[PDB]
């Protein structure tokens, strides 16, 4: 039993491959979760899984391939694709009731879940550097 979802935030896309387990501790890339070098980002990725059952619903084997932005945005993207995968699994193989329980509690707890946070970038324009602070003034 499988589903495959994606995270998207900034220019990082994550790809969450779900393959049926009823145990497996969740991991990322080539480095699992206890060996993720930035402790802070590790903690972010934890709150995804930890909340809404620590290993009570989080029992699927979920590994990811995340590329396309710096370390921080990849960790964000990770959380998203994980929780997406759980939800979609509990949609197909299991009733809407269980999904509604899980989902509602995700939505509540400040990520939102649903949002890609799709605020990207600015263009550089004119005759001007970034958004305005110009060169610096001539007298007026």
């Amino acid at each position: 039993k499988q589903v495959q979802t994606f995270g998207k935030k900034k220019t990082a896309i994550a790809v969450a491959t779900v393959t049926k387990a009823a145990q497996c501790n969740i991991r990322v890339n080539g480095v699992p979760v206890s060996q993720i070098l930035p402790e802070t980002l590790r903690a972010k990725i934890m709150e995804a899984v930890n909340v809404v059952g620590s290993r009570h619903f989080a029992r699927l084997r979920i590994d990811v391939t995340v590329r396309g932005a710096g370390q921080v945005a990849q960790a964000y993207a990770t959380r998203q694709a994980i929780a997406k995968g759980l939800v979609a699994y509990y949609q197909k193989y299991k009733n809407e009731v269980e999904k509604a329980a899980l989902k509602d509690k995700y939505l509540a707890y400040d990520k939102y879940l649903l949002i890609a946070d799709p605020r990207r970038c600015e263009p550089k324009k004119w005759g001007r550097h970034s958004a305005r602070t110009r060169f610096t003034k001539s007298y007026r």
């Binding site: 080539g30 060996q35 070098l37």
Partner: protein, 140 residues
């Protein structure tokens, strides 16, 4: 592949083969140790371990990334130009090790310039990292 990032590759895959390799000699120690290892130093090459934080790691990179060498392998090299001429700092590398590190793999845990394992000795001997530290590890 197998090596690096399965034991925490940053600091708990390094010290253990380091001890073992210095206790019974294996890798190159060729003169050139004193010479600049990383761009625009104002100091000597390092305080201690001039070319003994290097060799297994320089195998590791090429191992898991498959035949990154001499120009790609300095990809996971370093250089910031951390002192500079009052212009914007730029990345570099020093070629000195490239020669020596493509020599290396023909002995000890790798085979050739096409095949980079044997029994993958480093992995197997690193299975005792997790078990017990040799540095008084925090996490063990």
């Amino acid at each position: 592949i197998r090596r690096i990032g399965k034991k925490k590759g940053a600091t708990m895959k390094d010290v253990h083969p380091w001890r073992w390799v210095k206790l019974c000699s294996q890798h190159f120690k060729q003169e050139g140790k004193l010479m600049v290892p990383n761009c625009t130093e104002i100091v000597k090459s390092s305080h201690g371990r001039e070319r003994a934080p290097q060799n297994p790691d320089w195998y590791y990179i090429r191992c898991a990334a498959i035949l990154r060498a001499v120009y790609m392998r300095p990809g996971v090299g370093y250089g910031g130009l951390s002192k500079r001429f009052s212009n914007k700092k730029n990345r570099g590398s020093r070629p000195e090790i490239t020669v020596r590190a493509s020599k290396g793999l023909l002995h000890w845990g790798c085979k050739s310039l096409t095949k980079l394992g044997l029994i993958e000795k480093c992995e197997s001997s690193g299975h005792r990292i997790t078990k017990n530290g040799r540095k008084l590890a925090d996490a063990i």
